[PDB]
Nucleic acid binder design. Structure first.
Lengths: 225, 115, 201, 306
RNA sequence: GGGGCGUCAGUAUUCAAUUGUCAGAGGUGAAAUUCUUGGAUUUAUUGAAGACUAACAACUGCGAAAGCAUUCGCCAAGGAUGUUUUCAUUAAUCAGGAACGUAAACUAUUAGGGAUCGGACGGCGUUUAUUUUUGACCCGUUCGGCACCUUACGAUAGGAGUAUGGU
């Protein structure tokens, strides 16, 4: 009610929403829905055209509203945007992140998690990091409370994990990699092939991070959309 | 239903009701907690959060988004990792005045090793 | 300015749900303390299931939930029930003015025997210093292994945060309890409502 | 900073004098074609420049500047609780004010210097000793403007209050505005105050003390005249006009004596109600407020059995 | 999760830059110092630096002790087990000496059992396994070791008041 400021500090307020226009967002190819939202960006003119900012921004959106399935209430993906059309905003994959609620919801006591990081490069020369997490399977019809794998057994599990993710992510392009990440084929094959060393309760890939994209090609970027 | 992303920074000293678009870049409207209460003691209070959420929901319904995805956080580096009263009271007032809520997530900065 | 009213009256589009994982020794106690939990969460409008096969508590917002902070209350409730707070206290977080906090104290002492001594010093002789802290701060303190889980009002959360850090940093909790008793005596009379109280502690 | 002409009998307004000055914001301007200009600053660079020089004064941002009508003195006020008077012709310094507790906001010269500060106080200092002659309290926020009369001080507690210097106690207070109050202008001929602030309203006040003093004077004149004509009617025995004048003068200890006399006159008219036909006539021709006031005295006379 | 050297990450904090900002922010029981229209706190994205390695994390593991928790590589060393392995007293103990280095504050067996981890062996079986390896789970035997409980087999190791007279 009473102000607090110093002498001559409140400038005359200008309306900031005259200079703002909306832009619908379309998702790339392998996701089920395409219209995902709307972004309020500044009005374009000379001295910083707004398409530079639209090339700069990224979005973070969950997978439930993309696949229309609430099985994926976790695994928030990130979408860069590099292209613009008329009242449109075409996007591309940038990363895939869990929610910290599920990261707390997976860790139990008296069982081992095994973490593995790889820096793998796809055939389209995108470098990316894959962070996989894998919790140890408590075998039914057992009595002992702690399902501890030995340390050498953990090292063998991590070696097989990095071998699987390298051999099944080095061969495909980025669109096929996202199409394999969506129903979690990688974690299923790690679960299938590590059970001769120590059975694992659940293998997920908890993070995907795209580090460098050396190409801007509208041909493949529009072949997505 | 145009989903805007509401960052609610609920600390013990002041609450920040902040509304952005889906990007995170362009702030639509923010009302801090202390600009609605004359007392710095009661700056972080459920009444302050209720007033801030009512003003933010009024501005965003004048702009016509009428749907929010709410991300709640607190001081998380060496802080408390728990939201103050501002989070509960702001979410209550925000959905009590219109504003179909979408996805709720508590995105607190959790250090892997701080000090 | 500080009191909070109960919610009088579909505010959810995406059907929210949360999960937490517990071990077997908690699976027994949760299996025979669960109907109290699902009774109060049905009074709040949130469906709460328990899975003894995988070992998972789930909450999910139903069609007829109207309080939107109820999902945060329920998420904190299943976090504390996983972290072995007793069931009436975990259900006491569902009131309006309560909040929980977890204080990680294992990072504060490099040594091990010194850490065990300082944790037992925080717990006190026959629990008397711990329940004295609970009385003076209106909190529920549970010295939980490497962590300390406290509940209560936000003021009490801040004071027990300060007391737990100062107990781990070799200041005695009896000294801190004397400090809090002096602060209570000074805040009793509002004739000394705004001075610097450092001349008394 | 700049100097504009005001051409009243035209629509022509020009900004024909401009001053570059220093690198920060010109905070305040003072004026003794005009003589010259003294400009203050957001930084510590105070300057003085002629119309068709710099100096260091304080540590923080300075606030206000004021000239004497003869142009021999000049004082500057700032946030580091010092007020500085210096020689205005040369680059010399005449001294320093010792300090106003938190930070001084406005100075004023009397045609005696006035300092309004960042605390809820206001002081009157001299040239001779450079000490405060007077100190005043009573505000609830900053004061931010002190104006000479023909003194007044605004506040930041939305109240503007006037008082006098030789007495030193508060004369009057004024409570029109909304949230804040910033500045005060004055009519130079008569005493008219123009108060404005962060709120958009500007209020113009005029002095009425001379008018209400004249009204109270003529009221006491009429009072002593009609009180003596009441005593005259009592001494003469004109009970009628005595009773009318007593009901007008509203004091009843004589009205009761007139009523006891008129109901015991020892020679009553036979048709009359109270003995006198003229008192019957005025009791018939009483107004509503006089009837109600007479009833409010009648209950008090009816209490006494005498 | 023994040590050294390199390497790889992870957040968080600080600092800086780019935008959207647009009136406070920060502390406290209240305040104040301070930062704040050249835009603080906040929102997003990058970059650098230094630190540390959450949750897993234990009535556990390793090291003689202080101590030791990110991945991978290299370098020696060490423990226990097994062997169809060797010299046959080399050994035990410590005078002298030698290497590693803000705190305190409630305190010949015991006789087995239940857990625990490190081997080695055995196996009715569930899951790897498209079937053999092999591993996970369950069980038994055997050495070895941190700790629990029971039993001992036993043991054994001046203060407070009140006065009186001096100084």
């Amino acid at each position: 009610r009473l102000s607090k400021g110093k002498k001559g500090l409140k400038k005359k307020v200008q309306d900031p929403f005259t200079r703002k226009d909306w832009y619908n967002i379309k998702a790339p190819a392998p996701f089920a829905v395409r219209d995902v939202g709307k972004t309020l960006v500044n009005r374009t003119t000379g001295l910083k055209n707004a398409n530079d900012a639209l090339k700069g921004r990224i979005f973070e959106v969950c997978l439930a509203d993309l696949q229309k399935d609430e099985d994926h209430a976790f695994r928030k993906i990130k979408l860069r945007v590099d292209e613009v059309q008329g009242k449109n905003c075409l996007t591309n994959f940038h990363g895939l992140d869990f929610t910290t609620d599920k990261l707390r919801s997976l860790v139990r006591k008296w069982q081992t998690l095994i973490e593995a990081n790889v820096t793998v490069t796809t055939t389209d020369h995108y470098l990316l990091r894959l962070f996989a997490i894998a919790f140890t399977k408590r075998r039914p019809n057992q009595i002992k409370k702690t399902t501890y794998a030995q340390s050498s057994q953990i090292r063998a599990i991590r070696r097989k994990m990095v071998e699987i993710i390298q051999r099944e992510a080095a061969s495909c392009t980025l669109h096929q990699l996202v199409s394999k990440l969506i129903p979690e084929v990688i974690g299923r094959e790690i679960e299938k092939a590590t059970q001769g060393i120590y059975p694992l309760q659940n293998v997920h890939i908890r993070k995907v991070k795209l580090l460098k994209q050396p190409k801007f090609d509208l041909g493949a970027l529009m072949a997505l959309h | 239903l145009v989903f805007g992303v509401a960052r609610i920074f609920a600390s013990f000293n002041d609450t920040f009701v902040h509304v952005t678009d889906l990007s995170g870049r362009e702030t639509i409207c923010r009302v801090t907690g202390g600009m609605k209460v004359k007392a710095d003691r009661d700056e972080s209070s459920p009444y302050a959060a209720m007033l801030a959420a009512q003003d933010v929901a009024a501005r965003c319904k004048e702009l016509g988004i009428t749907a929010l995805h709410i991300k709640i956080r607190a001081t998380g580096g060496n802080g408390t990792k728990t939201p103050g009263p501002g989070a509960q009271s702001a979410l209550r007032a925000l959905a009590r005045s219109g504003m179909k809520i979408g996805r709720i997530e508590d995105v607190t900065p959790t250090p892997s090793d701080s000090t | 300015k500080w009191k909070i009213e109960p919610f009088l009256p579909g505010p959810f589009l995406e059907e929210s749900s949360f999960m937490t994982l517990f071990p077997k020794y908690r699976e027994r106690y949760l299996k025979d303390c669960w109907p109290l939990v699902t009774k109060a969460l049905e009074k709040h409008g949130i469906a709460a299931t328990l899975d003894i096969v995988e070992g998972s508590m789930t909450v999910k917002t139903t069609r007829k939930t109207y309080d939107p902070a109820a999902i945060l209350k329920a998420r904190d409730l299943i976090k504390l029930l996983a972290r072995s707070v007793p069931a009436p206290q975990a259900l006491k977080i569902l009131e309006d003015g309560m909040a929980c906090d977890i204080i990680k104290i294992r990072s504060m002492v490099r040594n091990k025997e010194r850490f065990v001594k300082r944790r037992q010093r925080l717990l006190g002789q026959n629990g008397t210093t711990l329940k004295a802290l609970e009385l003076l701060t209106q909190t529920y303190i549970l010295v939980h292994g490497n962590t300390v889980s406290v509940m209560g009002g936000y003021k009490g959360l801040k004071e027990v945060r300060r007391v737990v850090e100062d107990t781990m940093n070799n200041i005695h909790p009896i000294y801190l309890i004397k400090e809090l008793m002096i602060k209570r005596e000074l805040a009793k009379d509002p004739a000394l409502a705004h001075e610097d109280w450092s001349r008394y502690l | 900073a700049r100097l504009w002409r005001v051409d009243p009998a035209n629509n022509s307004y020009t900004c024909y004098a401009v001053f570059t000055g220093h690198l920060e914001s010109v905070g305040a301007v003072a004026l003794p074609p005009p003589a010259f200009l003294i400009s203050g600053s957001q930084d510590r660079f105070v300057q003085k420049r002629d119309i068709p020089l710099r100096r260091l004064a304080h540590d923080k941002d300075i606030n206000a500047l004021d000239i004497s009508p003869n142009g021999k003195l000049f004082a500057s006020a700032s946030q580091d609780k010092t007020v500085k008077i210096w020689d205005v012709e040369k680059l010399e310094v005449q001294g320093i004010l010792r300090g106003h507790k938190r930070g001084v906001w406005t100075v004023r010269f009397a045609p005696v210097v006035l300092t309004g500060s960042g605390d809820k106080t206001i002081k009157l200092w001299n040239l001779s000793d450079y000490t405060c002659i007077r100190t005043f309290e009573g505000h609830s926020h900053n004061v931010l403007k002190v104006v000479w009369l023909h003194f007044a001080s605004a506040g930041a507690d939305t109240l503007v209050k006037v008082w006098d210097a030789n007495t030193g106690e508060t004369e009057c207070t004024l409570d029109n505005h909304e949230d804040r109050l910033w500045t005060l202008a004055v009519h130079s001929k008569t005493n008219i105050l123009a108060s404005a602030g962060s709120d958009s309203k500007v209020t113009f006040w005029r002095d009425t003390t001379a008018e209400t003093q004249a009204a109270a004077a003529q009221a006491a004149l009429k009072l002593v005249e009609q009180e003596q004509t009441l005593e005259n009617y009592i001494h003469a025995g004109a009970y009628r006009d005595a009773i009318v004048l007593a009901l007008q003068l509203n004091h009843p200890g004589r009205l009761l004596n007139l009523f006891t006399n008129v109901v015991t006159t020892r020679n009553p008219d036979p048709d009359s109600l109270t003995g006198l036909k003229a008192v019957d006539d005025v009791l018939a021709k009483l107004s509503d407020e006089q009837i109600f006031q007479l009833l409010l005295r009648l209950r008090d006379w009816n209490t006494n059995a005498r």
